Design a protein around this ligand. Structure first.
Ligand SMILES: CC(C)(COP(=O)(O)OP(=O)(O)OC[C@H]1O[C@@H](n2cnc3c(N)ncnc32)[C@H](O)[C@@H]1OP(=O)(O)O)[C@@H](O)C(=O)NCCC(=O)NCCSC(=O)c1ccccc1
Ligand code: SF4
Lengths: 375, 438
């Protein structure tokens, strides 16, 4: 309608065009990134454009020789994008350790995408709850910095790292400000619009993306809302990047007012702490971030984070979107469901392949909406 | 069929009895005020051993495999876990273990015994989730060692620091949870015994390189399992030495596990129980499985020997390295475990591919049968890149799908037909090669 979020929608639809033109404009390298734990500040400080690999949500038959079909649709969809040449402009590829299934995407990509010139695996600690994890991750981040300085031949100074962290933290703060509008009774930002913003943050130059977020927030105070809010939903899952599916959800008489997913809140939630040692500031920002299920032990801190978000954004119903075969989220799901339901939030469970016909999902969401309207 | 002498393993009965005693000791732990704990076969079990000689583990994956042998009980356990609400495509050992806990039934009789604490290693994602649910249902303390520091070959001081410092937290944890004072002498003894048993298991496996193979992998499943029960115990280390003497005597005497041996096979991950009968059928072709990276290195610890071959890792006291104090023992113990071959593919599948190609060479393997194991994400990640690397090398290789713990996902009929087709393929290849070289 008013088209306020059209720049984010263009960036998402035309992400590869954007990357190629960025290389023309800057002379810089592009790095395909995997998992939201990638320490992007280092890549930015090294003069590089980080672009998060995402799937295309279309039929594909190139990954069967590389990844066995017992593994999730996302790790296979992502790998196909590399094999099909759609990230051929990316010189680098990098993964920061998390879910073990995702590590296959990285391993097959670096071995079989012939445009890869360098790769790096960051073994970020999984046990962020350990008193030793932040020292261990400090040294991983410093070692990646040394790798990147050696690779480019250019010293990556503390000043360059601080300026990059400042851009990333500004992006995180602006995304949090954008999210704040979703708490209102009639949100000036829909779930789809929020997702266009939060997803493109992961493959657009953060300086350019911040400028667009600032323009967007400058408009929001005076933005007219025409649509009815309907039921207040939360979406929960691992990546959850099928924006078309989210648009179906919001067309049934609902608004997604908050999420727990790596296309959204779990990517950006916290900015780093003020801190004079920039490597510590960066490494700890990631250790302190709301945890992937894989990194959430011995305590399930995720359960309090998800319920807290649900309460803070006045959620009426929570929708679990699950990738087939997704072990980390499958391991949390039964008790996280219970935690929400015991605290007054009914839930719906939906399970996804690489592609699925949307009609059966719409019928289920419409039925869920009915449950909300009773009691 | 008359090519080689054969003989049944004489220590068979003792291997069986040691395993039975392990499970019975866990169930009877409290009769004399012992300690019980649970965790993976990959848990660093010398740390709980510092709390006394009456500290009994139940390792989760071998226990679940023992339930899986009882198809009916395993189905009941998985049905209970599904009723709770867990997805059926989660790790089949984890689902079996959960269901047996909810049913409150031990596979060896009696209630499911309550552990005093969880002590776990985390490298597979399901390693945390498995015992998070257990510790919550049992209301017990829980500790997790994060060993995700990347390939052993890339190890740094800081990476080893992270694991060693966590182990010191683990010592404090087990003291708190048990109420006992940790004893450096018992701990160091347990570290040394774990180094002995895991290196000696590797030495035993390395005897299988000769023709005829003295062991078959079906027989080895009753032998490699001891280190998955309590690799840090004296009984396990002493049995591995005894076992090595017997296998050395088999090699000296030209004893074959399979008397008509003509074809040597290598497998990969843990198979379903129903496959064992296929090994027996394979023997009518003269095919013997000599092993797998799984049997050799789920617990076996290896090094490069002076001739470039793969053998048991040298014990530090045979290298002039003393172990006389807790801090030295902790760091050496972390380093020993980080070298485990079966942890490397969690980071880089090509490390496992190279390991499989080296086993094919050194154990003189004619053909490879890969289990695409839908029941275990942790040991299946990278499996198709491993198949590709073996395919390129020119060694015959086939796959079959299964699930080690849930036979709903294993097709006995189709798998046996695929394995028979493979035997035909190996024959055809032999005829062609002979025709080319006359
Ligand atoms: C006890 C079982 C369970 C059964 O085994 P079986 O032996 O097959 O069955 P039986 O007990 O009934 O014995 C009868 C058989 O004995 C044979 N025989 C007779 N005389 C001799 C002789 N003198 N010598 C040799 N053999 C002799 C006789 O031929 C007969 O067999 P046949 O009918 O002819 O074919 C044993 O295989 C075992 O412990 N497996 C290990 C499973 C486990 O717990 N694994 C660890 C999971 S950890 C993991 O996965 C993981 C960990 C961490 C991370 C990730 C993953
Ligand atoms: S998936 Fe395999 S490696 Fe992971 S807990 Fe289960 S048995 Fe262990």
């Amino acid at each position: 309608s008013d088209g306020l979020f059209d720049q984010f929608k263009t960036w998402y639809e035309k992400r590869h065009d954007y990357a190629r033109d960025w290389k023309v404009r800057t002379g810089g390298q592009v790095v395909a990134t995997m998992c939201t734990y990638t320490p992007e500040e280092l890549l930015i400080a090294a003069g590089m454009l980080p672009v998060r690999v995402l799937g295309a949500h279309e039929p594909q038959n190139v990954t069967e020789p590389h990844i066995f079909g017992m593994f999730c649709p996302f790790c296979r969809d992502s790998l196909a994008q590399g094999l099909l040449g759609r990230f051929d402009y990316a010189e680098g590829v990098t993964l920061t350790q998390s879910c073990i299934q995702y590590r296959q995407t990285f391993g097959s990509w670096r071995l079989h995408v012939p445009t890869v010139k360098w790769d790096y695996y960051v073994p970020m600690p999984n046990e962020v709850q350990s008193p030793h994890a932040r020292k261990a991750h400090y040294e991983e981040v410093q070692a990646f910095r040394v790798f990147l300085q050696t690779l480019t031949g250019k010293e990556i100074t503390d000043a360059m790292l601080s300026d990059a962290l400042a851009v990333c933290d500004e992006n995180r703060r602006l995304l949090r400000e954008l999210y704040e509008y979703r708490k209102a009774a009639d949100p000036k930002v829909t779930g789809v619009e929020a997702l266009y913003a939060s997803l493109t943050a992961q493959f657009i130059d953060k300086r350019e993306h911040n400028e667009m977020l600032k323009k967007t927030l400058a408009a929001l105070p005076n933005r007219k809302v025409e649509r009815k809010t309907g039921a207040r939903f939360m979406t929960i899952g691992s990546e959850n990047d099928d924006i078309a599916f989210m648009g179906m959800v919001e067309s049934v008489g609902a608004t997604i007012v908050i999420d727990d997913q790596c296309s959204g809140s779990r990517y950006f939630w916290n900015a780093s702490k003020p801190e004079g040692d920039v490597i510590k500031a960066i490494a700890e920002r990631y250790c302190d971030r709301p945890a992937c299920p894989t990194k959430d032990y011995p305590a399930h801190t995720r359960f309090d984070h998800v319920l807290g978000m649900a309460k803070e954004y006045n959620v009426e119903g929570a929708i679990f979107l699950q990738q087939k075969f997704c072990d980390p989220h499958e391991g949390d799901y039964p008790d996280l469901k219970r935690h929400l339901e015991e605290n007054g939030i009914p839930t719906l469970f939906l399970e996804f392949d690489i592609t699925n016909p949307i009609g059966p999902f719409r019928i289920r969401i419409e039925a869920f909406l009915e449950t909300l309207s009773e009691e | 069929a008359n090519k080689y002498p054969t003989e049944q393993l004489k220590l068979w009965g003792k291997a069986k009895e040691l395993r039975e005693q392990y499970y019975m000791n866990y169930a009877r732990a409290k009769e004399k005020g012992g300690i019980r704990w649970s965790g993976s076969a990959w848990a660093l079990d010398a740390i709980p051993a510092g709390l006394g000689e009456d500290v009994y583990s139940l390792t989760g994956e071998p226990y679940a495999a023992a339930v899986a042998h009882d198809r009916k009980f395993a189905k009941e356990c998985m049905d209970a876990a599904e009723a709770y609400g867990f997805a059926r495509d989660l790790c089949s050992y984890m689902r079996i273990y959960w269901g047996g806990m909810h049913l409150n039934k031990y596979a060896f009789g009696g209630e499911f015994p309550k552990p005093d604490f969880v002590f776990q290693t985390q490298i597979c994602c399901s390693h945390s989730k498995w015992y998070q649910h257990v510790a919550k249902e049992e209301k017990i303390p829980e500790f997790y060692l994060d060993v995700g520091v990347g390939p052993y070959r890339d190890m740094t001081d800081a990476r080893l620091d992270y694991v060693a410092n966590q182990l010191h937290d683990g010592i404090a944890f087990v003291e708190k949870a048990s109420g006992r004072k940790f004893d450096d002498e018992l701990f160091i003894k347990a570290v040394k015994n774990e180094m002995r048993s895991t290196s000696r298991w590797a030495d035993i496996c390395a005897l299988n390189k000769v023709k005829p193979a003295p062991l078959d992998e079906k027989t080895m499943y009753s032998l490699y399992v001891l280190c998955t029960l309590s690799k840090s115990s004296q009984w396990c280390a002493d049995f591995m030495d005894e076992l090595y003497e017997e296998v050395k005597d088999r090699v000296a005497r030209g004893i074959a596990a399979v008397p008509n041996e003509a074809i040597r096979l290598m497998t990969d991950t843990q198979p379903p129980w129903s496959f064992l009968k296929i090994f027996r059928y394979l023997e009518t072709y003269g095919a013997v499985s000599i092993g797998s990276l799984y049997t050799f290195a789920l617990e076996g610890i290896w090094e490069d020997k002076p001739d470039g071959s793969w053998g048991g890792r040298t014990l530090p006291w045979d290298k002039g390295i003393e172990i006389n104090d807790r801090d030295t023992a902790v760091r050496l113990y972390a380093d020993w475990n980080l070298s485990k071959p079966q942890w490397q593919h969690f980071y880089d599948p090509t490390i496992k591919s190279d390991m499989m190609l080296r086993i094919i060479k050194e154990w003189q393997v004619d053909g490879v049968m890969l289990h695409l194991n839908r029941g275990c994400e942790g040991l299946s990640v990278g499996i198709m890149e491993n198949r590709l690397a073996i395919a390129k090398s020119g060694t015959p290789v086939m796959t079959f799908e299964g699930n080690m713990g849930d036979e709903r996902e294993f097709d006995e009929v189709r798998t046996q037909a695929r394995v028979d087709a493979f035997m035909e393929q190996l024959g055809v290849r032999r005829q062609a090669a002979s025709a080319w070289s006359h």
